Design an enzyme around this catalytic site. Structure first.
Site, PDB file in Angstrom:
ATOM      1  N   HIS A 142       8.340  13.006 -30.686  1.00 34.75           N
ATOM      2  CA  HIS A 142       7.336  13.843 -31.344  1.00 34.75           C
ATOM      3  C   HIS A 142       7.818  15.292 -31.447  1.00 34.75           C
ATOM      4  O   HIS A 142       7.717  15.925 -32.504  1.00 34.75           O
ATOM      5  CB  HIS A 142       6.026  13.726 -30.538  1.00 34.75           C
ATOM      6  CG  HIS A 142       4.876  14.561 -31.055  1.00 34.75           C
ATOM      7  ND1 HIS A 142       3.739  14.028 -31.630  1.00 34.75           N
ATOM      8  CD2 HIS A 142       4.675  15.907 -31.053  1.00 34.75           C
ATOM      9  CE1 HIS A 142       2.915  15.012 -31.987  1.00 34.75           C
ATOM     10  NE2 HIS A 142       3.459  16.173 -31.649  1.00 34.75           N
ATOM     11  N   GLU A 143       8.346  15.826 -30.352  1.00 29.84           N
ATOM     12  CA  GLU A 143       8.800  17.207 -30.333  1.00 29.84           C
ATOM     13  C   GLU A 143       9.990  17.418 -31.252  1.00 29.84           C
ATOM     14  O   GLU A 143      10.022  18.378 -32.031  1.00 29.84           O
ATOM     15  CB  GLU A 143       9.116  17.679 -28.919  1.00 29.84           C
ATOM     16  CG  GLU A 143       7.981  17.547 -27.896  1.00 29.84           C
ATOM     17  CD  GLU A 143       6.624  17.980 -28.359  1.00 29.84           C
ATOM     18  OE1 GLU A 143       6.586  18.904 -29.184  1.00 29.84           O
ATOM     19  OE2 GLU A 143       5.598  17.393 -27.903  1.00 29.84           O
ATOM     20  N   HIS A 146       9.058  17.638 -34.881  1.00 25.86           N
ATOM     21  CA  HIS A 146       8.594  18.929 -35.378  1.00 25.86           C
ATOM     22  C   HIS A 146       9.753  19.747 -35.959  1.00 25.86           C
ATOM     23  O   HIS A 146       9.604  20.416 -36.995  1.00 25.86           O
ATOM     24  CB  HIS A 146       7.887  19.726 -34.281  1.00 25.86           C
ATOM     25  CG  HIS A 146       6.454  19.321 -34.059  1.00 25.86           C
ATOM     26  ND1 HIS A 146       5.527  19.303 -35.072  1.00 25.86           N
ATOM     27  CD2 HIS A 146       5.795  18.901 -32.944  1.00 25.86           C
ATOM     28  CE1 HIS A 146       4.357  18.916 -34.587  1.00 25.86           C
ATOM     29  NE2 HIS A 146       4.480  18.673 -33.292  1.00 25.86           N
ATOM     30  N   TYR A 157       1.354  24.857 -40.038  1.00 25.46           N
ATOM     31  CA  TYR A 157       0.684  24.244 -38.875  1.00 25.46           C
ATOM     32  C   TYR A 157      -0.798  24.621 -38.807  1.00 25.46           C
ATOM     33  O   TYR A 157      -1.277  25.193 -37.835  1.00 25.46           O
ATOM     34  CB  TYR A 157       1.421  24.590 -37.590  1.00 25.46           C
ATOM     35  CG  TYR A 157       1.184  23.624 -36.455  1.00 25.46           C
ATOM     36  CD1 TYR A 157       1.565  22.298 -36.567  1.00 25.46           C
ATOM     37  CD2 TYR A 157       0.646  24.034 -35.260  1.00 25.46           C
ATOM     38  CE1 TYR A 157       1.416  21.411 -35.535  1.00 25.46           C
ATOM     39  CE2 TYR A 157       0.477  23.143 -34.191  1.00 25.46           C
ATOM     40  CZ  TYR A 157       0.870  21.831 -34.329  1.00 25.46           C
ATOM     41  OH  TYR A 157       0.692  20.992 -33.264  1.00 25.46           O
ATOM     42  N   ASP A 226      -8.081  24.281 -32.595  1.00 26.98           N
ATOM     43  CA  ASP A 226      -6.860  23.489 -32.714  1.00 26.98           C
ATOM     44  C   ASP A 226      -6.206  23.702 -34.084  1.00 26.98           C
ATOM     45  O   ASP A 226      -5.764  22.763 -34.748  1.00 26.98           O
ATOM     46  CB  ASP A 226      -7.191  22.012 -32.469  1.00 26.98           C
ATOM     47  CG  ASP A 226      -5.980  21.108 -32.466  1.00 26.98           C
ATOM     48  OD1 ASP A 226      -4.855  21.495 -32.014  1.00 26.98           O
ATOM     49  OD2 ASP A 226      -6.146  19.949 -32.879  1.00 26.98           O
TER      50      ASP A 226
HETATM   51  C1  8JQ Z   1       2.794  14.540 -27.756  1.00 33.10           C
HETATM   52  C2  8JQ Z   1       1.963  15.409 -26.822  1.00 33.10           C
HETATM   53  C3  8JQ Z   1       2.106  14.947 -25.382  1.00 33.10           C
HETATM   54  C4  8JQ Z   1       2.332  16.881 -26.947  1.00 33.10           C
HETATM   55  C5  8JQ Z   1       1.905  17.515 -28.266  1.00 33.10           C
HETATM   56  N1  8JQ Z   1       2.398  18.897 -28.314  1.00 33.10           N
HETATM   57  P1  8JQ Z   1       2.777  19.622 -29.758  1.00 33.10           P
HETATM   58  O1  8JQ Z   1       1.921  18.988 -30.839  1.00 33.10           O
HETATM   59  O2  8JQ Z   1       4.230  19.542 -30.133  1.00 33.10           O
HETATM   60  C6  8JQ Z   1       2.309  21.371 -29.533  1.00 33.10           C
HETATM   61  N2  8JQ Z   1       2.978  22.173 -30.528  1.00 33.10           N
HETATM   62  C7  8JQ Z   1       2.443  23.351 -31.046  1.00 33.10           C
HETATM   63  O3  8JQ Z   1       1.430  23.842 -30.679  1.00 33.10           O
HETATM   64  O4  8JQ Z   1       3.314  23.860 -32.000  1.00 33.10           O
HETATM   65  C8  8JQ Z   1       3.027  25.134 -32.515  1.00 33.10           C
HETATM   66  C9  8JQ Z   1       4.038  26.147 -32.009  1.00 33.10           C
HETATM   67  C10 8JQ Z   1       4.883  26.848 -32.897  1.00 33.10           C
HETATM   68  C11 8JQ Z   1       5.808  27.776 -32.403  1.00 33.10           C
HETATM   69  C12 8JQ Z   1       5.891  28.030 -31.046  1.00 33.10           C
HETATM   70  C13 8JQ Z   1       5.075  27.320 -30.186  1.00 33.10           C
HETATM   71  C14 8JQ Z   1       4.170  26.398 -30.645  1.00 33.10           C
HETATM   72  C15 8JQ Z   1       0.403  17.419 -28.410  1.00 33.10           C
HETATM   73  O5  8JQ Z   1      -0.166  16.501 -28.931  1.00 33.10           O
HETATM   74  N3  8JQ Z   1      -0.264  18.505 -27.854  1.00 33.10           N
HETATM   75  C16 8JQ Z   1      -1.713  18.588 -27.813  1.00 33.10           C
HETATM   76  C17 8JQ Z   1      -2.110  18.259 -26.368  1.00 33.10           C
HETATM   77  N4  8JQ Z   1      -3.538  18.179 -26.148  1.00 33.10           N
HETATM   78 ZN    ZN Z   2       2.880  18.015 -32.246  1.00 36.80          ZN
END
Ligand code: 8JQ
Ligand code: ZN
Ligand code: CA
Ligand code: CA
Ligand code: CA
Ligand code: CA
Length: 316
Positions: A142-143, A146, A157, A226
């Site tokens: 998933h990460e 992105h 986003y 969110d």
């Molecule tokens: C798969 C699960 C365990 C994790 C997931 N995390 P994510 O979507 O990747 C967060 N990325 C998120 O904010 O990017 C925005 C962002 C941009 C630039 C710098 C920092 C950040 C999720 O669903 N997180 C929600 C958990 N309740």
């Molecule tokens: Zn994500």
């Protein structure tokens, strides 16, 4: 670092033993030279400065409890690289073998993981909501997905584009989990979520509503939390993707499944050829229809099933 490629051994978050690609130069580093321009794993040491220090180990054995999140971040980044290369002919996240960097032990009690624009970052969790999040192959993929999205469609986003961004990461996270073929499912994060509760997960693609997320456009979230519901409204697209692959009848609309491999081909083409930073759900449908047409033909079952799946979730 400059050194020679080596193979270490260690245990991941769930206690499983695996071999890892390392580099020797005085220490053994979590630096895998076998994939692209390398996969590099760093220790953030419970702080929030990034990336932290390239992970160094004296003996090439990674069995300490503190090592486990690093073992899995490093190993599962390799699996994800292999999926993109072998399945989609894509070389790392930029298509040009960019170095893949991850930091583990980020912060304290941190119940999340993210791509920060340049690297992957994993919390250890608080031990109650999550254990160290790199223990989930779907999470790691998933990460990294992105990063793929950011280099390709560039989906902003927020709101619908951001929910598509999220769904793309859940879709490919799941397809990587199936590729590795260890306890695969259509749930997100089950291996690292809520160690005291069996059988749950953060999200479900097969039944988003199991965890409160919408499974039809009429149930979309329209507020501001969110980033406009990016992790909520992703359920609508996740459900469509699940239906394309596996089939089903949803709100009375029947979808003939075409399987995971074709799902992946259609969505990968949509992501890399047709989506734009501001695409909305209707535009995703059009991109998926066009992608399936390119790959399988206008009169194909694959195109028909893409249309049925988006109809089933209320996206015209
Ligand atoms: C798969 C699960 C365990 C994790 C997931 N995390 P994510 O979507 O990747 C967060 N990325 C998120 O904010 O990017 C925005 C962002 C941009 C630039 C710098 C920092 C950040 C999720 O669903 N997180 C929600 C958990 N309740
Ligand atoms: Zn994500
Ligand atoms: Ca060691
Ligand atoms: Ca699983
Ligand atoms: Ca999963
Ligand atoms: Ca659980």
């Amino acid at each position: 670092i400059t050194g020679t490629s080596t193979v270490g051994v260690g245990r991941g978050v769930l206690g499983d033993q695996k071999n890892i690609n390392t580099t020797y130069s005085t220490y053994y580093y979590l630096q895998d030279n076998t994939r692209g321009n390398g996969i590099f794993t760093y220790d953030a040491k419970y702080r929030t400065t990034l990336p932290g220090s390239l992970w160094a180990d004296a003996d090439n054995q990674f069995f300490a409890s503190y090592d486990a999140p690093a073992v899995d971040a490093h190993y599962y980044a390799g699996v994800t690289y292999d999926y993109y290369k072998n399945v989609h002919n894509r070389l790392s996240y930029d298509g040009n073998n960019a170095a893949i960097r991850s930091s583990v032990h980020y912060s304290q009690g941190y119940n999340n993981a993210f791509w920060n624009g340049s690297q992957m970052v994993y919390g250890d969790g608080d031990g109650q909501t999550f254990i160290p999040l790199s223990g989930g192959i779907d999470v790691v993929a998933h990460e990294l997905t992105h990063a793929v999205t950011d280099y390709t469609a560039g989906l902003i986003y927020q709101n619908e584009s951001g929910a598509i961004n999220e769904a793309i990461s859940d879709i490919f996270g799941t397809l990587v989990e199936f590729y590795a073929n260890k306890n695969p499912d259509w749930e997100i994060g089950e291996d690292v979520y809520t160690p005291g509760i069996s059988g749950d997960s953060l999200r479900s693609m097969s039944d988003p509503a199991k965890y409160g997320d919408p499974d039809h456009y009429s149930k979309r979230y329209t507020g501001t939390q969110d980033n406009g519901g990016v992790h909520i409204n992703s359920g609508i697209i996740n459900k469509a993707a699940y239906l394309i692959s596996q089939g089903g009848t949803h709100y009375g609309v029947s979808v003939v499944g075409i399987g995971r491999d074709k799902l992946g081909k259609i969505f990968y083409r949509a992501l890399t050829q047709y989506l734009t930073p501001t695409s909305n759900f209707s535009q995703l449908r059009a991109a998926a229809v066009q992608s399936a047409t390119d790959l399988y033909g206008s009169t194909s079952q694959e195109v028909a099933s893409v249309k049925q799946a988006f109809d089933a979730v209320g996206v015209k």
